[PDB]
Amino acid sequence: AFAGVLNDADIAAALEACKAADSFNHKAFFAKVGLTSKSADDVKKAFAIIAQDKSGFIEEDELKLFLQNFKADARALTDGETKTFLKAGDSDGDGKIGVDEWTALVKA
Ligand SMILES: [Ca+2]
Ligand SMILES: [Ca+2]
């Protein structure tokens, strides 16, 4: 779903690095996959994908499936990984990650 925004090479290496359960770190994934250097238009396309439906937010259960947006058969994040990722992104603490949070998080 990221064809045209992120290259396959980086996506391959990013998934590879966080292979073992609990090895995931969103900041490392962002950097390796090439997200932090993308335009505002691509960063919003990325949000629309990860957020799945049209609730306008990345709900926790959606976050858990973060890696699958890149590779269909990727593993789901662990409860631990999901919580760490959510905690760092959910600035307003409403339990989910909205667009502003996403934009900001990608800039941190
Ligand atoms: Ca959603
Ligand atoms: Ca939030």
CATH number of 1-108: 1.10.238.10
Solved with: X-ray
Domain residue ranges in the chain: 1-108
Question: Residue 83, Cβ neighbours under 10 Å: how many?
Answer: 14
Looking at all shown ligands, the one closest to residue 48's CA atom is 1
The partner residues of 108 in beta bridges, in order of sequence, read none
- Ligand 1 centroid to 100 CA: how many Å? 14
3-class secondary structure for the chain?
A: CCCCCCCHHHHHHHHHHCCCCCCCCHHHHHHHHCHHHCCHHHHHHHHHHHCCCCCCEECHHHHHCHHHHCCCCCCCCCHHHHHHHHHHHCCCCCCCEEHHHHHHHHHC
Token representation of residue 49: 């994908």
Looking at all shown ligands, the one closest to residue 54's CA atom is 1
Comparing CA positions, the residue from 7, 101, 33 lying closest to residue 63 is 101
- Ligand 1 centroid to 59 CA: how many Å? 5
* Ion ligand 2 — residues with CB < 5 Å: 90, 92, 94
Looking at all shown ligands, the one closest to residue 58's CA atom is 1
